[PDB]
Assembly symmetry: D2
Homo-oligomer: 68 residues x 4
């Protein structure tokens, strides 16, 4: 065979495309996933750090408010 052989070439090429692409999309998503928890953990720590300092302020304002 020759043409019907070339035919089988494509049908295999294609089905090789879908599988390839479906992996890629998953990489795209996992990639986002990571850059997502990353931001999230940063933003968070900050928001927390903040809380850890709005403490000491209200702290000093009344913890030292005894000798004052």
């Amino acid at each position: 065979a020759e043409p019907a052989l070339r035919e089988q070439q494509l049908q295999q090429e294609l089905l090789a495309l879908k599988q390839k692409q479906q992996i890629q999309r998953q990489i795209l998503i996992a990639e986002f996933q990571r850059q997502f928890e990353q931001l999230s953990r940063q933003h968070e720590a900050q928001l927390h750090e903040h809380i850890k300092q709005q403490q000491e302020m209200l702290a000093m304002k009344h913890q030292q408010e005894l000798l004052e």
Copy 2:
């Protein structure tokens, strides 16, 4: 004033944190947006490429097979 000033500091820094982050998130998203249409246009072109070449195959398997 002084403590009631240090108070005003934090109150302000916070409202800054929010605004910052609210933007960073938008950058994160726009970033994904791009890496998304990008993949999408690649994947597509390919899938279209396939369609372009699967043309000639079935073409020549019968356009040249007419002389055969």
Copy 3:
């Protein structure tokens, strides 16, 4: 004509399929975008509400601590 028409039809349809999908993807993304700032504003408010709470606590554990 005849096939040259059914041929033009497909080329027509195809350029239409891309048009469509290219938009849908945008809807998918906008959709995520929204469910994203939404969560982000919730999570945030909470994290902020928590800031108001941890305030009054440190507050009263020392605000009326004068009468103690």
Copy 4:
């Protein structure tokens, strides 16, 4: 004790807020993930459908161009 208790309430209350949020985000993402492969499989199938038909056209065009 008491304040040292109300303190402990929040300290734990907060460390609980993170847990919640940290998972909620994962639901948001998994959610997107699904709506993503879903669209992707749809769009794809269609794009392939087009192929299984741009075939028959060029097909019946010249396959029947033997009796013509």
